[model samples]
Target: MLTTLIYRSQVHPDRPPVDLDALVHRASSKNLPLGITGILLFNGLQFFQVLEGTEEALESLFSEIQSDPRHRDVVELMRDYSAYRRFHGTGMRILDLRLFETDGALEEILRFSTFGVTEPVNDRMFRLLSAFIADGGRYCLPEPLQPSRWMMMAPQHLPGQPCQFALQAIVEPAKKRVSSFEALIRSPTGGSPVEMFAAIAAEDRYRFDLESKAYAFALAGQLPLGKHQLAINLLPGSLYHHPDAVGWLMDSLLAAGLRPDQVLIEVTETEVITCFDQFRKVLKALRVAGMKLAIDDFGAGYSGLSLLTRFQPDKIKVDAELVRDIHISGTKQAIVASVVRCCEDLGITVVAEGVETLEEWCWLQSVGIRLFQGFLFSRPCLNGIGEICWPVAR
Candidate 1:
């Protein structure tokens, strides 16, 4: 049987309002798996929510909702059981109370209700919610926020200078020490790394990866040794597939006075193994060469779980997309918890990436994730290691 349940609760005021984006994204990811659809409404300080699904699923999820620490004083305002769902195909259509105020008709409805007449509030809420769900909850905001740019390649904008290398610190929280640094390429003019890479043809991608690693390796020679590891990124089916390519990177590492064991070869999340056997062979070759392999941007890709079983990487860096605002998000916590559990069983180190907030860092620690990388600790630096006085967990 299908059913709908409505409730309202006070949102904890300590967290910033931008967390609403995290909530919406996480809920959409979570509820989609449970076959539950509804709308979530939030003003600056409260949440009014409606959920519809199978009676069993509704009851189960609601029980969980009551236990979630993000909200309090949850009160069920209404329940309607019917042969069909009123809001269909709009998987958890989220609405904020401000959106309702913008509608002139809803303003009139609210003015009439005035807390003395309760049904109008529910009616207005339901009607506004229903009107939007028919279109499957596809909506936009004014001046939508664009995605942030990642530091990919450092190129010189000045007359004919090549790209430069930079290091972003990755830390070990439990050990209270620097774990490693990711080797990054940045342009001189602060241009888009994506744009630069896009301009390069497919055949040159492998060469770019090799040259970047070599330059980064050469720069590592100037830094203190044994304090941290240095991670170099690679294009998965690139030069590594060729038997002759095995000695090329090793030669650079040695000539630069760096140890193979202290270096990690990282493959981004989007990289696909064109030939599975070749990929396996190449990674194993790196392992034999004393270099660790890391699957970067772990959760953001389609092949993470599968790769976990097939690829014996030394580490997996959790994508920052999932790490953002994890302290306030049930869905993120759940996803992160599951990923961490899996990594533990496989004996792979899990490094949380894109940790920009102290709350996120502390929450990750509470959940037993000890390795981290992001602006929260330090941004990518040129010339030498990033200076950081680690934030002590209280």
Candidate 2:
């Protein structure tokens, strides 16, 4: 199959400055021999490239590009079969937009961006290329700041009342088995998480947040998790503030007899994450240490699509609001269907969260969502896995 792959990536900070001329020459030489044709766009700080070739060739080249240490945050915008070559005859061409005025650069970009394009995926790629050039290729995230020594210190135990955790099962409906258990924080007296957190002083919230994971790990270790992953909620700012949070988690997991790969770190989307670059760095570290990452309440946050483009998570839980009564809501169905298609294309798992009614579950399943979590399956259990209510066959 003739496949087209479009991707955007930021230059790695530690990489020696890119030599545009030599880089393009070398790539062009290599691509021509492999029967590949593409265009490379450089805006001084980032790269946006579109490659077209046989599936095998493109896949091999893309793997090499992904493994290259010269760039970071390489995200695929589109991957689809093209009926015909879009950049025909060009082994590889470099558009150094940094050398031209904004208008000139945009004009030059438009010439090839939409050349012989009719597919929706191709159109989307063009729009992204246009946006990148218009924005002067500035990264959405600010430069990452070096972590302060104090920030790197092990999270200290604070003098405050500790919180407890409740476990909820995430079920894979098609397979009729529990895929994971998400640990929800609660108070000692069974108070709501809101009530529990409200009582904590502001200055100590960060410390409390980091330390609580230890409790979650210790408590969950007592359960017969078997092969299911343990999911734990985390605040993004905590990771950004405490660069050593992953090390702390590994220590706690060690004490709890759980492997790093057995834990899934869920970062709630509604929580403010002011420094995404720094956040991405910590997430990279977490993945490197064998932990899986997920975005909790995905559409409920401000940076849904933008975040997906910058950093692809292992899974994304669709917000409860979007899942509630989706069977009857055309708008909700449309939105969720789009999310499912997008995630499927990117090879990321889509989890329909807060699925409560049979109607909701049926509609979600009909639309190809198999993993779910909600009251319909089971309510959160206090420090234990609750009984799961599997739906009867229709």
Candidate 3:
């Protein structure tokens, strides 16, 4: 039912080119009422067609297809035929073996990327050029990211959107002076909520999350040599998949002339991380080696105040939704007020997010919330694009 397709076969016997067009026409006409779709593939050497529909409809089509008129032998490729449900497209497409295998994977990869970037990013980078189905063209998003709000709007690497991320940041927010205070994370192509994070949990090396190349360049441009720090988000799981993420990132940081203290490795919370014991173990090693850690997006999806006591990350970001209504809703005021208060009591730093208005800012300050970030102050950016012009020292 979830992503389904149906399969069946046909044959024509005793005559050469046994009225192919007419025979296919009659077969299609008969099966049309049965509701199975898919293209009828033709080969004079042997006949192969893929029909898809509900069980009952496929049964009807299968029965009729068994009686095709031009060939003597009929075979159904059940092993090769049962495929994923991509019932969105209709009718048959003639394919050559070379183009069929290569192009088909390309098409699927394109489909896969709409949700996130497929790994072997380098392979993904070059896939479009050589993939067989270059002729397939675009299949379009199942729907858009806005209004429709599909759980997954597109594959990982759509033209306008990128699946991977790169973040930059240094130890002290005020002292850092915007020179180096960012990080990045590459959301892999095939991850569900749980798996990709697990990869980050145990990874060792960092590669450029290809999608964030521009941001990386920005990091290089903006860093003031020894004065700035940048943290890159890593999915250790991908290293488990690739093994060199840590070394790559560290080497890049050193090559960039930034110190270990300048970098703050951020681990996003998206999975039910029960214990930071193991994470802390790896982190301590990284920390001693001169890196810091921050738990990002701490109030959304996989993070919350409840885990705060145990995890006790160096920095915490206030969820934007709570920030949205600081002026209009008392509930929001209470939540933000409590979080800032709780974090302060625990000696933890808190960042107020989604600051889009003067009133929100005035109120947040009134409640003793400082070290804030959001659209009100700035947006994640490169070369000041979409970022507020913070005119302090810079």
Candidate 4:
């Protein structure tokens, strides 16, 4: 429900042409202390400027404008807590198009210029969109392109087992709102995820670390060294049994100058993992030596309460199935609550994965579960890392 406000006006009938250059200057003056972003439209005279600011800020700003001298007959057009965020990366996005909803509209939507939609759009962009749609295109990003304003998600930071490690990025958006981040170790490959993982698994040593380094190199800004968080998937078998794997990972992180918290060790529940006592010992030593760890896809097949009880991890990442439909079934909610309670009792933090909506977020928040990561927050990126918008006080 990020699209929480709407304002309309018949002033559109007698409106003065807005000074876009001036408006751009104002909006960019400084991002308001309260988050505010939106769209400004002009139908030759009928105007629509959809601004999304904090309730307190919009109310105050609107109160002052309701009686403005230049326009008459002001009205609020639309308002609600929508699941979508119309503008994010863009500072200000302005479009001039018609409301012809029939065949005529579809035609105009295809032709009319989203060109000057904002100051940043250019011909290359228009062509790209055209080509994309011509070939099943999806979105239009802004120049100095930041992440899509519409897509919500932050980067990821997953559950850390007693000695497991996880990666994290500092500021990532979740459905327009910024939450935390979580990521698993991805199989690097010359081909698909399947090929990559399979090839790595066949070896005594997995290629996740080498892939991780290449990942770091490929994505310098999106995944920086000092600040950006990350989750490095370790070869559980190698990490525990062969000490060199651990040494290799540590040396790599040191070379990269990345922090322990910046990486998360993801160990899946699929295997009949060799030894429990040895596993915990290996994990303890790794953490002592500075590495974060997390259990991956926990609660998936055969992932029992026994494992959780034994691990008592720093963070418990809920399996996606458990997270996705939590709102739909009271049974699921109950299960989630019970888990939250168990984690609470053990003083273990929790993360709800695969979150996609505000209803889900509100429900998750009310349950006293603090950390969360999912599509509602960010899409698992194709590139090394998705663009990050720092929420540092500006």
TM-score per prediction, in order, is 0.62, 0.59, 0.44, 0.48
Model 3 — which ten-residue stretch has the worst lDDT? 137-146
lDDT of each: 0.68, 0.76, 0.47, 0.50
Question: Which candidate has the top score in TM-score?
Answer: 1
Cα deviation in Å at residue 254, candidate 1?
A: 0.3
Positional deviation of residue 327's Cα in model 1 after best superposition, in angstroms: 2.5
**Candidate 3 local lDDT, 317-389, one digit each (tens):** 6767667755534345556678788888888766665666555555566556766665544555432223343
User: What would the per-residue lDDT of candidate 4 be over residues 132-178, giving only the tens digit for each residue?
Assistant: 22421111111112221223324343222111122343222323333
Off by over 4 Å in 4: 1-192, 199-201, 204-222, 225-228, 270-277, 387-394
Top candidate (lDDT): 2
Model 1 agreement with the true structure over 217-318: per-residue lDDT tens digits: 877887775646898877775556445565788998899999889889888767744356567767777888998888887878565576666666889898
TM-score of 2: 0.59
Worst 10 residues of 1 by lDDT: 141-150
Better of 1 and 3 by lDDT: 1
The local lDDT score (0 to 100) that residue 322 gets in candidate 4 is: 74
Off by over 4 Å in 2: 1-161, 272-274
* Model 1 ranges with Cα > 4 A deviation: 1-161, 188-192, 198-201, 241-243, 273-275
Clashes of 1: 8
How high is the lDDT of residue 97 in model 1? 52
CA RMSD (A), model 1: 14.2
lDDT, model 1, position 95: 60
Candidate 2 lDDT over residue span 236-332, tens digit each: 8666667588898899988998998899999876663446666777888999999999888877756466567778988888999889866545456
